[PDB]
Every structure is written in C-alpha cells, then in structure tokens.
C-alpha cells in the first residue's frame, strides 16, 4: 500500500556523472564508455550568450580547452565534435561503470527521473513529466546544466533529458541526449517563454486507477461518458484530449480495477466540474498528473531493475 | 527554481541490498562490511506470525538455513545473532561496495530516503519523513520488508530505517538498523494502530521559507503572532507545538528571506484559519510538512554529496 512520487534508483546514472570546464565555465557532463556529453553552451562566455555562433565558437576551441574530471581524476579529452545543441567530447578512458544504455526522445506526457548535479557531484533524484508545452518543472540551480533525465528498463538507462536553462517562469527547458531542445527552445539568451501548458489527462486517470488500487473510492460515480463528451468537458478546464490509443493504455488499470475507462473519465468529469471539496486522493488535494499509467502499474505491481 | 520532494542519490546503498531467504520467506536485507541485516521475522512461518518466541526461533536454526543472494552471487552464512528485532549474518565475504556509513536513530519530524526493494533489487527512491506518531507515509508492497531509509552527509550514508510492516491504514512501520522499532509497534501479527498523527509545524513552516525563496509570496502579511498564540492556533488544527528550539532551527532561512519565524507563523496562522482559497503554494493545494529545515536549504542552496 501506498503511493509515492517514486524515481528509479540512481546509482547506474551516478557512476557517469563528471565534471566537464571550459574557460570561466563549469557545468556537468555524461560520461559513456569514452564520451562526455554535456551542453554546447559550455563554449560560451559571459557575453558570447546574446547570440552565439557556435560553429565559429567550436573552430576556435583546442581539445586542452576542455577540462574534464570523473571524481578526483582529471580525464584528457583527444577529440571534440557538436551533435546539435551538445558537445562530445571524445576522451583517452572509457567509463568501466557504463550501464547498458540507450538515448530516447520521449513524448509530452512521459515521465523521467532527474539526477541533479553540481560540479559532477549529484544532489538528488526526483520524478518529473514532459510537460505538453515541452517545459519540465524540474528543481535546478546554476551549476546544474548537463544533468540528465533518464528512465530504467530492467539492466537498460533510458537517456532522455539534459539539463541547458531556465525560463522565467521558473521552469525548465533541455534537450534529449542528442542535443535536440524539446520544443521550441534556443541556447540563446534571448526572449523565450514556455508556452501555455495544460493537463495530461491520461495520467491524471491513471492515477485515479493508482486512488483506487489503493483504496480511495469516494470519487467514483455509477455514471458513464461518451468519449467526445468527455473530451468536450478536458478542452473547458485545459485539460489534453484523451485519443483511443490513451484509453487503450488505460486498458490493464481498467481490467484490474474493474472499472471501465470511460466510466472513470465521468469520474474525473464530476471531478473537475464539482471540485474535490475539502477531499484529497492518494494524500493531494490536487488532480496529480505526473504519473503515467506505466508508473502506476510499476508501483502498484513491485517491478524492479537490474 | 523550483521545488520538489528530492531523495538523496541512492547508488551508494544499492550497492550493498540482498536477498535473504529461510523458508518460505524471502525478504530484503542489507549487505556492510561482512554482515547483513534484516528483519528477524524472516526466521518466521506462516503460523509463527501470531506470537512468535524469536528466541526459540532463532535457537532452532542453523546457518545454512539462511540463503543470502548479492546478485547472482551465493553469499555463505558463517554466523547469526539477533539484536532486537533485525538479525545480524555474518558472512564470510565483506562487501566490497560498503560506502562510509553510520546507523542513526531519526527524531520523529526528520526526513530520509528510502529505496524500495524486492528480492534484493532496488525497485524505485522516493523522500518519506517519520510521522510524529511514528509511521511512514511510504510505498511498499509483498517483498519490501528490509527496504532501508537513509541520508547521506557527503560521503556518509546515516542508514536510519528498516521496513518491517504494513499497518491497517496503509502506513508503515519498522525499526532503526539496531532493530528498535519506531513507535510502539512490536513484530508480532497482533492488532495494532498508527495512532492519532499530527502535522509537523516546523516542517510546513520551513517549505513557507522554500515557497518565498521561489517567489510565491501571496500568503505572507503583516501581521504577527507570540509563539504562545501560535501554538494556540496549532493545537486547533491538530498541528505539533512550535518550540524555541525550532524557532532557532528557522533561523537561517529567515535571515536569507528577511522573513523574522514569527512573522512567518502569523501567515501559517491565517492559512490554517481561511484554508488556500482555490490557491497553490510550491504547486501544492496543501500545507507540505515533509520538508526540513535542513531539507529547504540543501535544495535551494545546491549542496552535494561525495
Ligand atoms: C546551467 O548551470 C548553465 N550555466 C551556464 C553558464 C554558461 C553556459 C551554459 C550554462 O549552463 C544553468 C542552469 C540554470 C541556472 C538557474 N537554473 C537553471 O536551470 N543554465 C543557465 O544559466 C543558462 C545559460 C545559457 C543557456 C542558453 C545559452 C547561453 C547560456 N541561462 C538560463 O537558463 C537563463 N535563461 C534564459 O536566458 O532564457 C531565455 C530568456 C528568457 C527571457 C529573457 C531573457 C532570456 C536563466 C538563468 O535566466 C533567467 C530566465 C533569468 C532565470
Ligand atoms: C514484508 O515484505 C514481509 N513479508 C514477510 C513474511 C514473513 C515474515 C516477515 C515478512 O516481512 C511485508 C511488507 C508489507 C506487506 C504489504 N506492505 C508491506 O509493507 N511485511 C509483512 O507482510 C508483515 C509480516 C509480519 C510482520 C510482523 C511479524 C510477523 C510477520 N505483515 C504485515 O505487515 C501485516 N501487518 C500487521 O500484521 O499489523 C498488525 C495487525 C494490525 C491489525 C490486525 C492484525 C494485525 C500486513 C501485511 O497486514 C495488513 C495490516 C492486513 C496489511
């Protein structure tokens, strides 16, 4: 019993960790057999950051330029190339604690662990979601850049976030592992803002599935929506269109809870039309959307990793 | 920016989680140095659950009853003793991977990581924080038992929580890593409750702090309150008493945020009394008491560990 904003374990992602400095700039990197990953952005100075080319930024860099610590070993970098918005540094070593790995770009709406970094050292673990605006409300602090989101699939780290800035709303904007941004986001400091970012629906019933599994059942109705209905009421309240292949997913929840999907979407329509009125569901007094329907069977059903 | 329940980096005790089985049962344990802790219950069957003699239990066993797995490795048995309610095997390998460690026994109000496992694999990290009344909020389900709650200081993991037990409402309960339960709770398949819990003022005071310090502000005033009066107000509202000494563990962040504790209890004041008002603080429609102190400023701050 239980439930919990849970990440994986973070040991397989701490051993890749390391330092990576270049002129007065230090940020973290990703160290995978005998490359660093880390933001392009490291290149930069103080007032290269307006508007920076950084292929004229890159030719005039050495590959002594590039300081690299794993802990307190200083690795020599033989090699230097951009991948879109992340240099790679090809280094003399390779990582002995490489995990069997994969780079994954994820879907708005899919939820990733953060190991926070600071000066290759981590901080913390905690989940997040892909916002629909392509933003993750992370918790990162300067010095942070090149932390990486990653899921865990049994022995496999799913790569698929690195950490580049902070917008001013005070959420975050990166890039998957090859260095592409997730949404419409620059590694320029100019004007960018986040975009209007709304509810994802399916993880919010996922989670109300999780409410149940574990008990909480006081927000369950006898009655049923079609799934236009339903999708006429989500659209009112900003929240994301619920598609076939979502109730579909939802299909395992459904099938051990007993509850159809579209029964629980009446739920979650009196829900949103009537409030929770001084209730809470699995301990929040808000509609949580930062579990996937995978997340919820993980954590209702025990799956480990190795 | 921004703010989330952050568990401490968990490789370092996943490194040294096995399984342990005797019997039918199959339980976590925890692998430092030469010896591996777990719940004695473990050297319990189906129908010694109800008032088990540990001691007759445990004089009947050998140590080849004991299969301890580290991976894929066979680990031998090479002694046992009980020390309260976990069992201490010695075996005859010391684990390789034992980090700088301490066992320490947590206050009710602190937090700890704890990392979810089965069969000795670790299933997911997540921030808990002991109740006042001596439960944990966690996630747990068949299997976790010998799950460990812990913090790191730098380089030292301060192991202070073993999972032993499921409480009727879905809480949990179990033992420092010396096998003195937390709470009045005893290993025994007897009728036992949680007690009546409280919320844990200092902590919601603290995440106020963590909320200005992100730039939510709506719910400061001008007013202000005796630590009398506010303990009065407390009361009302089932929270724990605010003591001096809590006051004085506050003090860094009201220096950082010019925010003097008192001051700041006048607004939890007028929260308790006029509820949120359909408002959020750190993304929560609720007050947040699993934040320490300590926790705020190590997040807001960037402190990590090594
Ligand atoms: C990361 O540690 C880092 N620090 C760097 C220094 C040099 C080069 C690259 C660096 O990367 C931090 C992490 C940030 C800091 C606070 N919280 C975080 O997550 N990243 C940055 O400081 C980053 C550096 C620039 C990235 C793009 C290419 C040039 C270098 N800056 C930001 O994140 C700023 N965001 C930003 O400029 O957004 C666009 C914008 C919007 C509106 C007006 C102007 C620009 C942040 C730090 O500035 C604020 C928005 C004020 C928070
Ligand atoms: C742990 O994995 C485990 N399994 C074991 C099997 C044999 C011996 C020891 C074991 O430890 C689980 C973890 C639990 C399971 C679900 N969520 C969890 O956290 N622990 C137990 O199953 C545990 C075993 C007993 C502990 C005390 C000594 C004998 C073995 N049992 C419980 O946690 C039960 N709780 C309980 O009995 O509380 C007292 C009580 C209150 C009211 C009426 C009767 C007894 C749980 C599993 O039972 C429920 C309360 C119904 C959930």
């Not at 070993?73 to 280094?91: A, D, F, Y």
């Not at 605006?133 to 918790?139: L, Q, R």
């Not at 329509?269 to 009125?277: T, Y």
């Amino acid at each position: 019993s239980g439930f919990r904003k849970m990440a994986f374990p973070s040991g397989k992602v701490e051993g890749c960790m390391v330092q990576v400095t270049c002129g007065t700039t230090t940020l973290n990197g990703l160290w995978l057999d005998d490359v660093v990953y880390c933001p392009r952005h490291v290149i930069c100075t103080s007032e290269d950051m307006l508007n920076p080319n950084y292929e004229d930024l890159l030719i005039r860099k050495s590959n002594h330029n590039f300081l690299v610590q794993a802990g307190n070993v200083q690795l020599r970098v033989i090699g230097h190339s951009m991948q879109n918005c992340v240099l790679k540094l090809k280094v003399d070593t390779a990582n002995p604690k490489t995990p069997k790995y994969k780079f994954v770009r994820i879907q708005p709406g899919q939820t990733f662990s953060v190991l926070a970094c600071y000066n290759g050292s981590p901080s913390g673990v905690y989940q997040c979601a892909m916002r629909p605006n392509f933003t993750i409300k992370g918790s990162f602090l300067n010095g942070s850049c090149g932390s990486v989101g990653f899921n865990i699939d049994y022995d496999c780290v799913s790569f698929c976030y690195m950490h580049h800035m902070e917008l001013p709303t005070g959420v975050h904007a990166g890039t998957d592992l090859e260095g592409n941004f997730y949404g419409p986001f620059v590694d320029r400091q100019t004007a960018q803002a986040a975009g209007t970012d709304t509810t994802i629906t399916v993880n919010v019933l996922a989670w109300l599935y999780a409410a149940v599994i574990n008990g909480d059942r006081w927000f369950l109705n006898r009655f049923t929506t079609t799934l236009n209905d339903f999708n006429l009421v989500a659209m009112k309240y900003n929240y994301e269109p619920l598609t076939q292949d979502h109730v579909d997913i939802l299909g395992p929840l459904s099938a051990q809870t007993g509850i159809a999907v579209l029964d629980m979407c009446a739920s979650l329509k009196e829900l949103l039309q009537n409030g929770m009125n001084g209730r809470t569901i699995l301990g929040s007094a808000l509609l949580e959307d930062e579990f996937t329907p995978f997340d919820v069977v993980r954590q209702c059903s025990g799956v480990t990793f190795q």
